[PDB]
Amino acid sequence: DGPEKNYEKTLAILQIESEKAELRLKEQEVRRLMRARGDGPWYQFPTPEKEFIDHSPKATPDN
Amino acid sequence: PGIVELPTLEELKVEEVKVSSAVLKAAAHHYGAQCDKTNKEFMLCRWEEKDPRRCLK
């Protein structure tokens, strides 16, 4: 084929490889923030299930 | 950090029911069926409020 194909394929490859490089750097920045701040969907660490708290009236009033 | 609020010793003065347990237990069944409404409101106050200072009336 002509030079066009090799040229424009190389442009297509470079774009793919470039978009991937920025996503990989963006994931490290994201993972650094979720882990240190716990305000994101990741690195959520368990806290006791509140559904097993006994809400009934007790033998004593002060509860 | 706060100052616990306590009633003064004259807010806690009432006429006591100074009878022994057997006296209460002998009269316990009739008393439960006579002083019920008054009794049943204090317990409601106590479980609702969860505070002894809020039901001193």
Q: Is the dihedral of CA A54, A55, A60, A62 positive or negative?
A: positive
Neighbours of B46 (CB within 10 A): 16
Which of the 8 DSSP states describes residue A45? P
Strands, DSSP E only, in chain B? none
Q: Are A31 and A24 in contact (CB under 8 A)?
A: no
- The residues, ordered by sequence, that sit 6+ positions from B10 with a Cβ below 8 Å of its Cβ are none
Distance in angstroms between the alpha carbons of the first and the last residue of chain B: 28
For residue A48, the SS3 value is coil
C-alpha span between B44 and B50 (Å, rounded): 10
> Alpha helices, DSSP H only, in A1-63?
3-37
C-alpha span between A8 and A2 (Å, rounded): 11
C-alpha span between A30 and A42 (Å, rounded): 10
Amino acid (1-letter code) at residue B21: S
Residue in chain B nearest A61 by alpha carbon: B47
Which of the 8 DSSP states describes residue A52? G
Which two tokens mark A19? Answer: 């978009």
> Among B50, B54, B55, which would you mutate to test the A interface (most chain A Cβ atoms within 10 Å of its Cβ)?
B50
- The residues, ordered by sequence, that sit 6+ positions from B31 with a Cβ below 8 Å of its Cβ are B24
Method: cryo-EM
Which two tokens mark A43? Answer: 């690195």
Q: Are A23 and A16 in contact (CB under 8 A)?
A: no
Q: Please tell me if residue A56 touches chain B, with a CB cutoff of 8 Å.
A: no
